[PDB]
Enzyme design. Sequence first.
Site, PDB file in Angstrom:
ATOM      1  N   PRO C   9       0.819  -1.213   0.000  1.00  0.00           N
ATOM      2  CA  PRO C   9       0.000   0.000   0.000  1.00  0.00           C
ATOM      3  C   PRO C   9       0.860   1.273   0.000  1.00  0.00           C
ATOM      4  O   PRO C   9       1.906   1.307   0.649  1.00  0.00           O
ATOM      5  CB  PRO C   9      -0.822  -0.109   1.297  1.00  0.00           C
ATOM      6  N   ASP C  41      -3.693   4.125  -2.064  1.00  0.00           N
ATOM      7  CA  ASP C  41      -4.912   4.467  -1.333  1.00  0.00           C
ATOM      8  C   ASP C  41      -5.350   5.903  -1.672  1.00  0.00           C
ATOM      9  O   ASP C  41      -5.564   6.737  -0.784  1.00  0.00           O
ATOM     10  CB  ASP C  41      -4.731   4.265   0.172  1.00  0.00           C
ATOM     11  N   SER C  93       5.252   0.945   2.658  1.00  0.00           N
ATOM     12  CA  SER C  93       5.814   1.742   1.581  1.00  0.00           C
ATOM     13  C   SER C  93       6.959   2.656   2.038  1.00  0.00           C
ATOM     14  O   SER C  93       7.515   3.371   1.209  1.00  0.00           O
ATOM     15  CB  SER C  93       4.728   2.576   0.959  1.00  0.00           C
ATOM     16  N   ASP C 177      -4.074  -5.320  12.524  1.00  0.00           N
ATOM     17  CA  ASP C 177      -2.931  -6.105  12.050  1.00  0.00           C
ATOM     18  C   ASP C 177      -2.738  -7.300  12.998  1.00  0.00           C
ATOM     19  O   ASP C 177      -2.524  -8.449  12.555  1.00  0.00           O
ATOM     20  CB  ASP C 177      -1.702  -5.207  11.874  1.00  0.00           C
TER      21      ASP C 177
HETATM   22  C1  LIG Z   1       6.099   0.501  14.741  1.00  0.00           C
HETATM   23  C2  LIG Z   1       4.729   0.112  14.260  1.00  0.00           C
HETATM   24  O1  LIG Z   1       3.828  -0.196  15.035  1.00  0.00           O
HETATM   25  N1  LIG Z   1       4.553   0.126  12.934  1.00  0.00           N
HETATM   26  C3  LIG Z   1       3.272  -0.218  12.317  1.00  0.00           C
HETATM   27  C4  LIG Z   1       2.633   1.021  11.707  1.00  0.00           C
HETATM   28  O2  LIG Z   1       3.548   1.514  10.734  1.00  0.00           O
HETATM   29  P1  LIG Z   1       3.724   3.066  10.454  1.00  0.00           P
HETATM   30  O3  LIG Z   1       3.153   3.848  11.617  1.00  0.00           O
HETATM   31  O4  LIG Z   1       5.156   3.300  10.061  1.00  0.00           O
HETATM   32  O5  LIG Z   1       2.712   3.187   9.210  1.00  0.00           O
HETATM   33  P2  LIG Z   1       3.216   3.459   7.701  1.00  0.00           P
HETATM   34  O6  LIG Z   1       3.430   4.942   7.517  1.00  0.00           O
HETATM   35  O7  LIG Z   1       4.324   2.448   7.404  1.00  0.00           O
HETATM   36  O8  LIG Z   1       1.848   3.028   7.008  1.00  0.00           O
HETATM   37  C5  LIG Z   1       1.498   1.656   6.896  1.00  0.00           C
HETATM   38  C6  LIG Z   1       1.070   1.346   5.471  1.00  0.00           C
HETATM   39  O9  LIG Z   1      -0.284   1.766   5.231  1.00  0.00           O
HETATM   40  C7  LIG Z   1      -0.320   2.654   4.114  1.00  0.00           C
HETATM   41  N2  LIG Z   1      -1.395   3.662   4.215  1.00  0.00           N
HETATM   42  C8  LIG Z   1      -1.244   4.785   4.940  1.00  0.00           C
HETATM   43  C9  LIG Z   1      -2.273   5.724   4.990  1.00  0.00           C
HETATM   44  C10 LIG Z   1      -3.457   5.485   4.286  1.00  0.00           C
HETATM   45  O10 LIG Z   1      -4.390   6.319   4.316  1.00  0.00           O
HETATM   46  N3  LIG Z   1      -3.599   4.361   3.574  1.00  0.00           N
HETATM   47  C11 LIG Z   1      -2.606   3.459   3.509  1.00  0.00           C
HETATM   48  O11 LIG Z   1      -2.785   2.431   2.823  1.00  0.00           O
HETATM   49  C12 LIG Z   1       1.082   3.246   4.032  1.00  0.00           C
HETATM   50  O12 LIG Z   1       1.425   3.772   2.738  1.00  0.00           O
HETATM   51  C13 LIG Z   1       1.933   2.063   4.450  1.00  0.00           C
HETATM   52  O13 LIG Z   1       2.182   1.168   3.358  1.00  0.00           O
HETATM   53  O14 LIG Z   1       1.396   0.693  11.073  1.00  0.00           O
HETATM   54  C14 LIG Z   1       1.515  -0.254  10.010  1.00  0.00           C
HETATM   55  C15 LIG Z   1       0.140  -0.529   9.400  1.00  0.00           C
HETATM   56  O15 LIG Z   1      -0.814  -0.796  10.421  1.00  0.00           O
HETATM   57  C16 LIG Z   1       2.142  -1.542  10.518  1.00  0.00           C
HETATM   58  O16 LIG Z   1       2.340  -2.426   9.403  1.00  0.00           O
HETATM   59  C17 LIG Z   1       3.462  -1.273  11.239  1.00  0.00           C
HETATM   60  O17 LIG Z   1       3.933  -2.472  11.841  1.00  0.00           O
END
Ligand SMILES: CC(=O)N[C@H]1[C@@H](OP(=O)(O)OP(=O)(O)OC[C@H]2O[C@@H](n3ccc(=O)[nH]c3=O)[C@H](O)[C@@H]2O)O[C@H](CO)[C@@H](O)[C@@H]1O
EC number: 2.4.1.-
Lengths: 316, 314, 310
Positions: C9, C41, C93, C177
């Site tokens: 995503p 998204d 991502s 998750d």
């Molecule tokens: C330290 C920790 O707890 N990290 C968690 C946190 O990552 P973290 O807080 O780093 O979340 P990210 O910024 O990595 O976003 C997670 C993913 O969801 C996507 N995204 C974001 C916004 C949106 O509106 N739609 C969408 O699809 C992002 O592009 C990305 O691929 O949340 C993620 C998704 O629950 C989990 O996999 C990670 O393990």
Amino acid sequence: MKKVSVIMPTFNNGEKLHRTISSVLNQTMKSTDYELIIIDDHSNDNGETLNVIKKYKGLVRFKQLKKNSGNASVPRNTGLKMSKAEYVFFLDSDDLLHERALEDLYNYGKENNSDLIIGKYGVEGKGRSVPKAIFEKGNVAKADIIDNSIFYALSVLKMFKKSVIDKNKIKFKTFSKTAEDQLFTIEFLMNSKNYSIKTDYEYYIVVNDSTGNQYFATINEIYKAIYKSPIYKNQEKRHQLAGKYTTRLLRHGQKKNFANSKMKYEDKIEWLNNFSKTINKVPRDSDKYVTQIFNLKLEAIRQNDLLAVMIADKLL
Amino acid sequence: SMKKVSVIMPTFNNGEKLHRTISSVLNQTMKSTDYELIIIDDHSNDNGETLNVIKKYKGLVRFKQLKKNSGNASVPRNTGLKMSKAEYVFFLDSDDLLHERALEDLYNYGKENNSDLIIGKYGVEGVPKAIFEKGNVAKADIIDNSIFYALSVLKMFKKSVIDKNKIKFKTFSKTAEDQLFTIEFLMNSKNYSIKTDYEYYIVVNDFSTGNQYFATINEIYKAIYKSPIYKNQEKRHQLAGKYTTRLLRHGQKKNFANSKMKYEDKIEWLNNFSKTINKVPRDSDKYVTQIFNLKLEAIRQNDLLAVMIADKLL
Amino acid sequence: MKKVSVIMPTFNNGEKLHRTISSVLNQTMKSTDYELIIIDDHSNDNGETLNVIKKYKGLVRFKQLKKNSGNASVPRNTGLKMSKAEYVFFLDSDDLLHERALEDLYNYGKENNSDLIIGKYGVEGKPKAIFEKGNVAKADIIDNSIFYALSVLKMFKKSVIDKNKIKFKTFSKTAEDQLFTIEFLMNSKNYSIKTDYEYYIVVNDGNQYFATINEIYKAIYKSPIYKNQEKRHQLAGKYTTRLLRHGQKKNFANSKMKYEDKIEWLNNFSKTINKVPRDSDKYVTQIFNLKLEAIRQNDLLAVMIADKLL
Ligand SMILES: CC(=O)N[C@H]1[C@@H](OP(=O)(O)OP(=O)(O)OC[C@H]2O[C@@H](n3ccc(=O)[nH]c3=O)[C@H](O)[C@@H]2O)O[C@H](CO)[C@@H](O)[C@@H]1O
Ligand SMILES: CC(=O)N[C@H]1[C@@H](OP(=O)(O)OP(=O)(O)OC[C@H]2O[C@@H](n3ccc(=O)[nH]c3=O)[C@H](O)[C@@H]2O)O[C@H](CO)[C@@H](O)[C@@H]1O
Ligand SMILES: CC(=O)N[C@H]1[C@@H](OP(=O)(O)OP(=O)(O)OC[C@H]2O[C@@H](n3ccc(=O)[nH]c3=O)[C@H](O)[C@@H]2O)O[C@H](CO)[C@@H](O)[C@@H]1O
Ligand SMILES: [Cl-]
Ligand SMILES: [Cl-]
Ligand SMILES: [Cl-]
Ligand SMILES: [Cl-]
Ligand SMILES: [Cl-]
Ligand SMILES: [Cl-]
Ligand SMILES: [Cl-]
Ligand SMILES: [Cl-]
Ligand SMILES: [Cl-]
Ligand SMILES: [Cl-]
Ligand SMILES: [Mg+2]
Ligand SMILES: [Mn+2]
Ligand SMILES: [Mn+2]
Ligand SMILES: [Mn+2]
Ligand SMILES: [Mn+2]
Ligand SMILES: [Mn+2]
Ligand SMILES: [Mn+2]
Ligand SMILES: [Mn+2]
């Protein structure tokens, strides 16, 4: 009239019993001045215990009960009715008298007009400790319940004046498996004035080998005995004794640390419900006499609040 | 010519001792003709001794005798207030002493700063402190200048504020009624001054249910939340929260829960405390010092066991 | 039929997305044996993210959602539907793969008939216990501390997901998750841990929540893998410990949260835990005894006190 009746209940002791009996028969006291009364609580050990007792016929008095009562209360009661002595002394079938026990305790009692004489305890084998604070001041002719820590030494393994037991109809209660001995000693204390402590030898050697329904009914009777005392008749004095007993109970009671234990929740609730019901029959005026570290724990029990007891125990 | 200052002094069985206090007022740097001493005797019964002392200053003081003993300073001080047509009043207790510069220094400072309230530094023979640590303060603030920690009425008050808002000492409580008078006054005025050049007022030290106490505390919170001066609701919450902190730090029987008070009396005390604080918006709680988080919640929950625990963890 | 679908995503990533995509495209695994599925998204960053994805036209599969879902759930569900591979691997991502990741985890899974393969995590910027013993062919949820590593940033066998219709929940912005990983664990038996390298590099820049936690306990107690009632008690109790150690707003009671919000939070917490058998409580770490009881009793003061004694 004998100076002393030793009252010893037996149950499935077998050949080990020789040692205890020998400790009673080898006293410095004149043989004609005392008796051993053995009450066997219907042993079922293929005749072994009874066969031991029969080897002393003519040197001891003996009765067997028809059915096993399950503890010392009925056999000890049976012994009291049999004795017409000046004093009785309760001996458990597994323990040992010092050879000087009967003579020294009786003489000291006679000298100080004692209703109760307590001989220092010894121990054989690791396990349960025996009371210590009561004996830390040496010999005491006229002891105090509070100053001489008598609420921490409430076994009946002591020398009791028989007339106090007779006049006051003091019997061992039969409805609980625990604290009956405490209740008997307390009933005795609350109906007598003169207590003596003898420390020259280790006179009595202790050998080491529920929902609370019955237990807390027994505790209830302890408090009732204090508050009806004809000796300690001042109301504030009763509050004080009741508070000192509460302290003892919180320090050494059954399952005292139940709240944070591995007991099932449902069992904790029932236990505390019984504890709370019993303590709430005790006047709050006694609470100021409880050692103050216990203030929260005691209030939590009164409030029947398991979370609060758990917290009180974490803070102690 | 209205007087600059009326000193209002209740008396009760002071005897010969009173000379010293009267004399401290009559010997001021202020022009004798610019102030008056109003003495209200709360039906002394000491074989005429107190009255004999007052009688020695006949013509130099104004005097009223009450015909029955009220039992505290409230009714006498209220009588004093009715009798004064001065610009400012100053409450003096019959066992204390004024510095010879008190009336002139405080009045002049008040006049210069258009002050509703002037607070002179206290001293002691045999008192609040943070309020006096910053030197003179022309335009003080309740929270920043720690005024909730110095709420006695032994201060100079502008009479017009008292008259316009009908401020009187309450007579339903033997405790905290002075705090309420000062709070009602603060909530109805803007301009407060602090003067510390001298120990202007000298305190001479000598050798319950909570119903009335907490009724008084209730009136303090109601004064804050109905203030025509502090009208903003968040400012009200802040003042209430700061008061709550003062109460938990210095209130009566603040450690009652683990004390030697009887159980029934603890339950009554806490019922009183709980119902009083539960009339105060919880929005005020964020202004209370964090260390009191559990104790304040336990009081709101009316849970004695929790208050006991909270105190043990402090 | 591909070996691995990497499901990534995206949302408002921008130029920094290049680094991530190339970490997938530069795998040691045979290029034709895996695919990168990008589910955008509905990025709204003036075309910046789209412009990056476009540069990989012909080297990735790509679907854009018509509206921003708000989190990874729906995009990941979309990715799952698009993938017909043996295994899926979820990649955030902003993160990076070690070039050996897909090859090494897949071979290890294939060797050990794994339903789940967990690669060791690395970090860029300013779970451990599971990796401390080295490689584990057939892991145990409790002994290998799996409840402390419940991210979906792992290799999952697609057939398990398909056969049990396992999907990300959309009604919770928190703990969805965990629920996915737990539903997978309770419907599968073979879990592997691979530790030779830091395989996955993490880059660092109550009504719905407790509804989710409720589903975690239901997944455990209805497990067709762990069918013994006492084993279910053990798993639930070990999960309770993890919840108390690392749960969302674990220290809410003495927090700056509004009283009314504290009451609502605790009320949801209480309601959820009171559906969990007390038989599970004996398996909870003993330091949490008071806190856990306070929660069952719905007693905010006791929770506040419990926290102060921890
Ligand atoms: C330290 C920790 O707890 N990290 C968690 C946190 O990552 P973290 O807080 O780093 O979340 P990210 O910024 O990595 O976003 C997670 C993913 O969801 C996507 N995204 C974001 C916004 C949106 O509106 N739609 C969408 O699809 C992002 O592009 C990305 O691929 O949340 C993620 C998704 O629950 C989990 O996999 C990670 O393990
Ligand atoms: C450290 C401690 O707390 N010790 C007490 C414990 O001793 P302890 O646990 O050693 O009890 P024992 O086994 O010595 O039994 C006490 C006496 O009861 C008799 N018996 C036993 C079973 C039976 O069905 N009938 C019967 O009469 C025994 O023979 C013995 O004479 O319990 C005794 C009986 O209340 C008390 O005197 C002791 O102070
Ligand atoms: C340290 C402290 O808390 N000090 C307060 C305390 O002083 P304190 O305890 O010293 O109170 P005092 O004895 O000074 O009495 C206060 C005044 O009330 C008068 N009086 C007394 C009894 C009576 O029946 N009628 C009567 O009018 C006294 O004469 C005196 O003028 O209470 C006073 C009265 O609220 C406050 O002003 C003080 O700030
Ligand atoms: Cl004893
Ligand atoms: Cl006991
Ligand atoms: Cl001057
Ligand atoms: Cl202010
Ligand atoms: Cl003050
Ligand atoms: Cl009061
Ligand atoms: Cl304002
Ligand atoms: Cl106060
Ligand atoms: Cl502030
Ligand atoms: Cl969580
Ligand atoms: Mg002058
Ligand atoms: Mn024994
Ligand atoms: Mn034994
Ligand atoms: Mn409670
Ligand atoms: Mn005074
Ligand atoms: Mn005085
Ligand atoms: Mn990320
Ligand atoms: Mn990021």
